[PDB]
């Protein structure tokens, strides 16, 4: 016998272990592989696909299609606020059930840039201009347009090209931020303001809707696998 000595850890079952083991079915011949469309190699490939944001998640609107609709209308002034929410892509109820959010909730750390695409869905006769703004943390969320304008922003002019992209760049003191809510790694604020009005001719509807989409940029990644808080169980199903 070769003289050996067992180390601590001997005979434990660690659920993330990677060891060989004898097969119960010697020489079994697996069914050959087929070329199937849509092969997935990495979960980030899913995260980079756009999905629809439920921005208007207020009261009973989460039990209908209205949660995905952002109201806009012709006003009797300018510069009022359209929406606002925080950059908490895994923890904000705005973001938590998107494709990006559902993947994030299996991880502890996230890093990288994010894209918000907006699509105007009024009639072709409606025109308008909007200010989309991101304000890094440290001073709170902006309350007027003249304070939102100081941060990073895009002025969207509505026309033949129906959609506009706001890029939220990675601006952080750390290389990563937590998926859970945490003030040391606060993300900042996203808001939208009327730059000019919505203007329509007679016999066109003066109320309209915008839709928002989220996805990850090519610089995005996640760390430290964990269990999601979304699925649960009291007994084994039947």
């Amino acid at each position: 016998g070769l003289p050996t000595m067992n180390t601590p850890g001997s005979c434990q079952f660690l659920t993330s272990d990677d060891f060989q083991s004898p097969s119960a079915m010697p020489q079994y011949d697996v069914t050959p592989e087929m070329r199937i469309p849509g092969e997935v190699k990495n979960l980030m490939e899913i995260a980079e696909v756009d999905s629809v944001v439920p921005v208007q998640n207020v009261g009973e609107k989460v039990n209908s299609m209205e949660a995905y609709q952002i109201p806009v209308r012709s006003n009797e002034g300018s510069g009022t606020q359209v929406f606002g929410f925080p950059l908490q892509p895994g923890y904000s109820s705005v973001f938590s059930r998107t494709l990006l959010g559902e993947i994030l909730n299996y991880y502890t750390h996230w890093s990288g840039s994010i894209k918000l695409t907006f699509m105007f869905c009024g009639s072709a006769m409606a025109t308008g201009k909007f200010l989309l703004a991101y304000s890094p943390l440290g001073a709170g969320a902006p309350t007027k347009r003249v304070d939102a304008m100081l941060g990073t922003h895009v002025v969207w002019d509505v026309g033949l090209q129906s959609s506009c992209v706001l890029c939220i760049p990675w601006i952080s003191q750390t290389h990563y931020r937590y998926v859970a809510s945490d003030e040391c790694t606060a993300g900042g604020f996203i808001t939208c303001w009327y730059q000019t009005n919505i203007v329509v001719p007679a016999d066109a509807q003066s109320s309209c809707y915008i839709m928002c989409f989220v996805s990850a940029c090519n610089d995005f990644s996640v760390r430290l696998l964990k269990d999601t808080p979304f699925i649960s169980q009291e007994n084994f199903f039947q």
């Binding site: 601590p8 005979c11 079952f13 660690l14 659920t15 502890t108 440290g138 040391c184 964990k226």
Partner: protein, 270 residues
């Protein structure tokens, strides 16, 4: 790794003044005995290997222990992972302002039968589960919870009598180093608790009995041992003088800078 030799020197009479300097400048003098006396030549072979930062830090230490029972009220243990509850390892780490390391975790789990009136006790062998929940993961609120299913949380299962269970953890910070000291706040208004960040957040450990054994009551104790590995460290500090008071802050009771003796020429301590 060796220490320096001693150069032999003879008598001297000159303008060179190696032993006179100015400590005001912040410089530490580089004087050796040959500067101020006649010395022989010595071939020194002594080594400095036992005081590398790695060898100084890389020993197992018990950071925490607790108990849980097979019946009654406290059926599982729960511990937020930290180095700041045990004095000996905390003090060694706080020699440095910033530090990177990996960890080797070892668990020492032992059990004791408790006094009772139950007759005919024939207990079977006890298995234990230890689950590690990263920060943000859901936590168990009872010993029989779906959380113990551990689809994505690493868990170790271990039966009494075998070797103690052990696993490695990589450097786990969102920052480029762990910070042992933080002179600031987490909230931008600085109206909160001072000295709190999340650069050292490591998660939570839960431990339970898988089976109850027999009809009698049994209490177990789990001791957790940390050994740092692959260490890098920066910005040395004065070692902690005053005794530790709290786990989450540096608060102290004032104390003298050393102990006393009788007079300024006394050759013994008091």
């Amino acid at each position: 790794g060796r220490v320096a030799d001693t150069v032999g020197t003879g008598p001297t009479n000159s303008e060179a003044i190696p032993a006179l300097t100015a400590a005001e400048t912040g410089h530490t003098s580089q004087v050796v005995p040959g500067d101020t006396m006649q010395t022989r030549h010595v071939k020194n072979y002594h080594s400095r290997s036992e005081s590398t930062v790695e060898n100084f830090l890389c020993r197992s230490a018990c950071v925490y222990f607790t108990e849980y029972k097979n019946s009654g009220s406290k059926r599982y243990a729960e511990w937020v992972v930290t180095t700041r509850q045990a004095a000996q390892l905390r003090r060694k780490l706080e020699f440095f302002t910033y530090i990177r390391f990996d960890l080797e975790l070892t668990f020492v789990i032992t059990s004791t039968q408790q006094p009772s009136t139950t007759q005919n006790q024939d207990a079977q062998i006890l298995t234990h589960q230890i689950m590690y929940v990263p920060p943000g993961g859901p936590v168990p609120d009872k010993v029989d919870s779906y959380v113990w299913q551990t689809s994505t949380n690493p868990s170790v299962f271990w039966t009494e009598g075998n070797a103690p269970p052990r696993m490695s953890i990589p450097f786990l910070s969102i920052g480029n180093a762990y910070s042992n000291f933080y002179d600031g706040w987490s909230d931008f208004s600085r109206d909160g608790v001072y000295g709190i960040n999340t650069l050292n957040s490591m998660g939570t450990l839960y431990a339970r009995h898988v089976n109850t054994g027999g009809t009698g009551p049994i209490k177990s104790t789990i001791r957790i041992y940390f050994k740092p590995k692959h260490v890098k460290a920066w910005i040395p500090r004065p070692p902690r003088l005053c005794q530790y008071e709290k786990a989450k802050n540096v608060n102290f009771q004032p104390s003298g800078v050393t102990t006393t003796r009788q007079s300024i020429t006394a050759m013994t301590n008091t």
